[PDB]
Design a protein around this motif. Sequence first.
Motif, short mmCIF file in Angstrom:
data_model
loop_
_atom_site.label_atom_id
_atom_site.label_comp_id
_atom_site.label_asym_id
_atom_site.label_seq_id
_atom_site.Cartn_x
_atom_site.Cartn_y
_atom_site.Cartn_z
N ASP A 215 0.73 8.14 -8.39
CA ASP A 215 2.02 8.29 -9.13
C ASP A 215 2.03 7.06 -9.92
O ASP A 215 2.51 7.01 -11.12
CB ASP A 215 3.13 8.37 -8.10
N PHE B 251 7.10 11.89 4.57
CA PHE B 251 5.85 10.95 5.03
C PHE B 251 6.10 9.58 4.80
O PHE B 251 5.98 8.81 5.73
CB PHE B 251 4.74 11.43 3.93
N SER C 3 -4.06 9.77 0.08
CA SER C 3 -2.90 10.52 -0.04
C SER C 3 -2.83 11.40 0.92
O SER C 3 -1.48 11.91 1.12
CB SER C 3 -2.74 10.64 -1.73
N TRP D 274 9.20 13.78 -0.15
CA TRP D 274 8.09 12.99 0.30
C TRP D 274 8.55 12.12 1.55
O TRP D 274 7.91 11.79 2.45
CB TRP D 274 7.64 12.11 -0.69
N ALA E 33 1.00 -1.11 -0.04
CA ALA E 33 0.01 0.08 0.06
C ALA E 33 0.98 1.10 0.03
O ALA E 33 0.84 2.24 -0.59
CB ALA E 33 -0.96 -0.16 1.29
N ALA E 34 1.90 1.07 0.77
CA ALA E 34 3.04 2.30 0.82
C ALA E 34 3.64 2.45 -0.43
O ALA E 34 3.92 3.48 -0.77
CB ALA E 34 3.96 1.82 1.88
N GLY E 35 3.69 1.50 -1.38
CA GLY E 35 4.45 1.41 -2.64
C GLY E 35 3.34 1.64 -3.82
O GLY E 35 3.68 1.04 -4.77
N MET E 36 2.24 2.24 -3.31
CA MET E 36 1.41 2.35 -4.65
C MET E 36 0.36 3.52 -4.38
O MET E 36 0.16 3.98 -3.13
CB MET E 36 0.65 1.28 -4.98
C1 LIG Z 1 2.32 5.10 -1.14
N1 LIG Z 1 2.48 6.55 -0.82
C2 LIG Z 1 1.22 7.25 -1.03
C3 LIG Z 1 2.99 6.38 0.56
C4 LIG Z 1 3.62 7.05 -1.55
C5 LIG Z 1 4.17 6.25 -2.93
O1 LIG Z 1 3.53 7.03 -4.09
#
Ligand SMILES: C[N+](C)(C)CCO
Lengths: 504, 508, 476
Positions: B97, B320, B408, B317, B91-94
Amino acid sequence: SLNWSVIVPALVIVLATVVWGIGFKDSFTNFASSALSAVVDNLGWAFILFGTVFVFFIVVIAASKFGTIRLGRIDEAPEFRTVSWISMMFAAGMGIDLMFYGTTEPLTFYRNGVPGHDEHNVGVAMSTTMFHWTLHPWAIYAIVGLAIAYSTFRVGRKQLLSSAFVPLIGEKGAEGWLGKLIDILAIIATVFGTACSLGLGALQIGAGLSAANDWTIVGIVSVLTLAFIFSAISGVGKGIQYLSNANMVLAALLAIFVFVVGPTVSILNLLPGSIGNYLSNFFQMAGRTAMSADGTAGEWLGSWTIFYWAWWISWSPFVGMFLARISRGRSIREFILGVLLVPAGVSTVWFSIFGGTAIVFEQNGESIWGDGAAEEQLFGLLHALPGGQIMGIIAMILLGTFFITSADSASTVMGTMSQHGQLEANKWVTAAWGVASNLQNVTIVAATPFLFVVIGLMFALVKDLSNDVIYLEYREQQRFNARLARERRVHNEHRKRELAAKRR
Amino acid sequence: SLNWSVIVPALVIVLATVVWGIGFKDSFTNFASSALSAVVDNLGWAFILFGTVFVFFIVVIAASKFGTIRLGRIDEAPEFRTVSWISMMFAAGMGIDLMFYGTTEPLTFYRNGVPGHDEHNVGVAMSTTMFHWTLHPWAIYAIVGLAIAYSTFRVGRKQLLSSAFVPLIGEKGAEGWLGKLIDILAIIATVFGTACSLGLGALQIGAGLSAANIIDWTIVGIVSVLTLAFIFSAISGVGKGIQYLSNANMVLAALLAIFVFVVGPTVSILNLLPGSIGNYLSNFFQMAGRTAMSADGTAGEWLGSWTIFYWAWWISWSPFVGMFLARISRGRSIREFILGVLLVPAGVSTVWFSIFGGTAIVFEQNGESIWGDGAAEEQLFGLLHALPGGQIMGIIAMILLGTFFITSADSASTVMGTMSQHGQLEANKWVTAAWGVATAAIGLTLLLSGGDNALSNLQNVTIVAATPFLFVVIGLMFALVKDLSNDVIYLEYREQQRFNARLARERR
Amino acid sequence: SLNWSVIVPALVIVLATVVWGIGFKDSFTNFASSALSAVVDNLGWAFILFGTVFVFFIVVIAASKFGTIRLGRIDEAPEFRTVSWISMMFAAGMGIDLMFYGTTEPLTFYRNGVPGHDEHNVGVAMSTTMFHWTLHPWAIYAIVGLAIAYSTFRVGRKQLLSSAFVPLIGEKGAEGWLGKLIDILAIIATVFGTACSLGLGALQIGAGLSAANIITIVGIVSVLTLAFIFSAISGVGKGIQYLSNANMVLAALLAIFVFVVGPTVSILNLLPGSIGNYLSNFFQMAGRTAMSADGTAGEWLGSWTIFYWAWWISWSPFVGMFLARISRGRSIREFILGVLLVPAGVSTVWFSIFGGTAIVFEQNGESIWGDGAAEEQLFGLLHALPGGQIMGIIAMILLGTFFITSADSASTVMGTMSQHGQLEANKWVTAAWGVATAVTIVAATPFLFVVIGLMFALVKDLSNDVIYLEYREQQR
Ligand SMILES: C[N+](C)(C)CCO
């Protein structure tokens, strides 16, 4: 005893195809040849993706503490001294495959050039031929090697291959859906796995005798040599050992022959040139995809790189079974570095002499390319040296011994898995198996699943050793050291605290 | 107890961008975006060098004995299971973007080629994209994650980037001249970071509206301000348990990866997995050294648009992701948490660009070509429309970039609240939303200023507001290495091997 | 104390060599040159192969247990600390080679390309230059450096190359065929090796003085620098310590002035640039056997990479000494990387600044290559900047600086390898052999191999150090 539960589904299919190839719809078998294409392009990736993962994992493990673990009952004396063991790998780390392919592969690449690069690149020519014949192929062995080896000599259980999967399907209860099936799929890829070099040996003579004295003389030649299978194991005492040194004398000779007769400096030069490039293009080689470059390499890759991968996988049983033996008393590391580095670094120096000269002769115009024929090149380039026939003879006989080395051993292995996995020499079954581009195709389809077998084998391997007492001790001990060292510290900070609040 | 010395200063800058940029002059905001060329021209090299440094940096501390130190108290254990912990990572990785750059990215590279690469170059093209989205981006996140997860967890300080510089800065109450400063450099960078994601995520959507209706310059104003209204229904009036869309995201993103995997050129897509990991590894150093001198000094321009931006964007970023990963992390080892971060997220990004971006390439080879007139915003809707029932999917796509914006924004405005009020884990619902709109306002403010090149002006400011923080994260190594040297476990060990040396010295 | 059984066989060749290349024989010492080619072609594989292993070797050495044990007496307080030590090592990092070659080489490779490529490419032109000037020339030192020091500071055996071969040969048993031959070919090597570093400098001064006193005189200079090789250590002491330090400040100044006045970014856009590339192109360049490509690079290899290794191989006894000498009490590890990290940084940046600027000038149409001679080029880009001629004066001096610290010390190694490998030697011997230089590839052709065995004598010998000998003499 014998396993007539694994043997029976064995030959029903072995011959189902054998007779299916000579008889019935004779050309029906050429629908399978156009059938691999489903597997090659649908699974090519799987082969490649995992083919490389196979190289990193074996190496981490040797490097890992798992390697100190020794292969046999705790505390065992090596079968051979650390300079006598060295001679042992050659017994397995060579064959007929090196000669036919070994002096044509660098050439064929220096000629056509591999997808992604221009022709006459000695560098790639060396980097792509080793990719197939060095680090990669051997790692498919050492995986199966270690799982098979650790299964039997350490744990002290059965020489049956599916065994090494008891740490995943459980132990002693993995004989059914998964298990017997594996052995079945094991014997098959060892009957086809053999002929791929056996019937091949006849083909290399079918165009090999041209150095002395064609497409049907093979039947007469095949029997000339096969009649000697029942003598070497069945009639003559002992297995291999004698031939292993024969290959060094015969191989070492024609090799040192060429390395001194052919200009040496170029071959010697390409000595680091070979490795150097390998390393520089190895990652890039491992990303080669039919998708790359521009997605036009598929038919190259299916032809070469996927051809060997599939093939090595469908041959890793014999060679995992054979390597396991004579590796008792040898540890994990010394066995992984064993099966790699040296067998790897012999091949390399072998394509360095056959390959370097083979090329240097095209650099001038003395092409050895015999109308694009694998058997023709070998000799086309030694009869271009003094006594071209004087060696060309020892090369024939070199492909003769190799016929029985592979056969002998292979049958040792195959015959071994039909007995309930016992080592004892079974004259009876060794002899029976003996007898048992469409040469390069029947092997690979036959043990297609095997790729997933060595994939899952990583786990069945890593899961099982990880319970090895020594290593089990090592990680238990870490917890005690880790927390004991906890008590020592939490106390100070209460002592150095109470003591501190005392200065008030 | 909201830090006001910290809160207002960040806003003075938030407001200045919006007030200066749209309400007044407008034409003048694009002047500061001449300054951007400024940053890339002569601070450009640094982003490029410390980028590849962060990656080595991190691996060797993971590799280093420190790797064994446990986040939290001695021999502490992780709060949740490896699988769960990981499960958090995908989840962190999507988000928005990948949606945006999932397809145009590697395509733009095959379409146009890379400096030093002939166009139509799959291996390169793919490996350059992998370059931006794997270890280098995630070395940064771990660099900052560690710093945070370590300061709060081990030495027990406040959850504030400043509280992670304490070893290198006074001290006697950290955050004097410095530190207030540092946190301020966090907030700001965290705003414009998320801004882009809110920004290009928005106009990805206005574009997507084409699939359902036809039919705009004002329409982007509506797109955000509605889901931006719905960050409040999301945080202003929480119902039941707040967690909920994080998965509501994952599933759609799953339907898309799965959908196109099978329908689209599957075997190709599969062929990109080995293929792209390999070019990457193989091209890892060659691209590492791509500055504005290669090629013949002509990559200058190419770096500006892409490669450099990833560097600026990942950095702005890290405040975050850094807290996120940290927060989840407590209970791991530095070694377990590094290897986890670089490898686990990276699986996804590699899989993603292979399928979403890897059909755009295949297509371009059969002449279909989803180039869509050369705009990357529409490429995602476009490639799908070249597949059976791709229209329904485009719809999900929008609703996905919808859910993403709120998710986000909430996660950002929490972190951004947390560091706006003295690093309290407890998060004030009222403050968060504030960072919701403020951020949304600048995200929108960047789209509107620019017109037809709305994308361009966005990436040039987020690049500037980033440039400062990049130094922060550089310094953050130095604190991080001095913090790990005084740590009990590494110290207590050096007393035992010197001992395991002295013990043997006198017996012999 | 003066060992006159090693001086003889060497002193005869030296007296003989200057002559046989003189008195109208000047031609037959030239066809004799081409017999170098002979070596580069059959020992071509030799360097290019090991050159690369030494690097991996020491790494694989500094990586493993041996690394931790301190050089010398068990756990000794070194003779320095990190912030100070860091200065002494720099002493070696800067030289006369890095004058003409820093500007010219990176420029050359950019312009004509190196084998297996196209030309005008900035990446290759850096990584190639860095490659000839990084880890490759510093392992062939580290092996010489690490071995010697351990023979004497750890073991305490006299400081002489053969003494390190004890392991492989025997305790006091080397004396025969191996060793006597060493000590002599570790002089021939020291003379000629530095002679191809001074020979370029005796000329480059006259060539560079064509930038000062526009425009025989070449030979007048040899003395005006040599005339202060003796009055610099014979009377007052401290030249080795004092000069190198100053000289670094000179080269620093030089570098820094160009760095700033010269576009700052380009240089500074090429730190990541050279490093990313040097790694990337590492294994391909390393395996750049002449066989590549198409059999072509035979010659390119012979002009620089291979010639490059020999000269470097020639440098092992004199260079390998000092870096051992400098280090006491400091673990081999803090030394192997010691002599690996510093060399790449001093070199890299240095090429970066001067070499890179040169590439910049070529790109903007401002070529400084003109005519095409290495010695004219450094001053070319120099005078192309404000204060050019001026910085040019110090750049001039730079040439002669260290030359004295590298002649007075090229002398020292001899004086110490003359009197039984004695750290301290009589003053007359060091200076007397300082006028010797007052063929480089084949000067050291056998000495390559002398390193290789030195690599086995350094591994086999340690495995008989106390930690490994104790476990050895236990259950096993
Ligand atoms: C998944 N995040 C929103 C934490 C950043 C990756 O674009």
